[PDB]
């Protein structure tokens, strides 16, 4: 029926190791995986995505633009969803601050690719018309 598997044996060890903040005094715990699970379903997002390398990539997409005007809750999410994500992408980090950059820089490339051809506005061009 319902199969639960967020962090396997290996992901578990690394998880407990990773910290929420760079200059904090506490590491990651299940409390963060569950807390985000109950908060996800609230945003019309099933908690099953937390155990999917693809889901995280999506969940972060909605929080990315939200970070601008997000609250304490919205922030904590991007943090957890960030670490858990890197774990599913065969990525290794020490804290959330680092993992976050890995997710931001990874997307920065997509922008350069989807914003390289549309950057030559200047002299008048040619085009048909019927006026
Ligand atoms: C009882 C109140 C319900 C009001 C109506 C439902 C609102 C809702 O679904 O909010 C989530 C939000 C996008 O929602 P909307 O902005 O209402 O979408 C409008 C357009 N349609 C309906 C076509 C999809 O997108 C987000 O998830 C952004 C918030 C960050 C959370 C990300 C997951 C952690």
Swiss-Prot record:
Interaction with host CALM1: where is this region? 7-42
The residue numbers the entry assigns to motif Nuclear localization signal are: 25-31
**Region listing for Interaction with membrane phosphatidylinositol 4,5-bisphosphate, in residue ranges:** 72-76
Q: Where is this region: Interaction with Gp41?
A: 6-30
> What ranges does the record give for the region Interaction with membrane phosphatidylinositol 4,5-bisphosphate and RNA, renumbered to this chain?
13-32
At the top level, the lineage of the source is Viruses
Q: Where is the lipid attached (N-myristoyl glycine)?
A: 1
Which compartment or compartments is the protein found in?
Answer: Virion membrane; Host nucleus; Host cytoplasm
- Region (Disordered) residue spans: 105-127
Instruction: List every position bearing Phosphotyrosine.
Output: 131
Q: What does the PTM comment of the record read?
A: Tyrosine phosphorylated presumably in the virion by a host kinase. Phosphorylation is apparently not a major regulator of membrane association.
**What membrane topology was assigned to this protein in its record?**
Lipid-anchor
Region described as Interaction with host AP3D1: 11-18
Renumbered to this chain, motif Nuclear export signal spans: 15-21
Q: How does it assemble?
A: Homotrimer; further assembles as hexamers of trimers. Matrix protein p17: Interacts with gp41 (via C-terminus). Interacts with host CALM1; this interaction induces a conformational change in the Matrix protein, triggering exposure of the myristate group. Interacts with host AP3D1; this interaction allows the polyprotein trafficking to multivesicular bodies during virus assembly. Part of the pre-integration complex (PIC) which is composed of viral genome, matrix protein, Vpr and integrase.
Q: What does this protein do?
A: Targets the polyprotein to the plasma membrane via a multipartite membrane-binding signal, that includes its myristoylated N-terminus. Matrix protein is part of the pre-integration complex. Implicated in the release from host cell mediated by Vpu. Binds to RNA.
Q: What is this protein called?
A: Matrix protein p17
Q: Species name for this entry?
A: Human immunodeficiency virus type 1 group M subtype B (isolate NY5) (HIV-1)
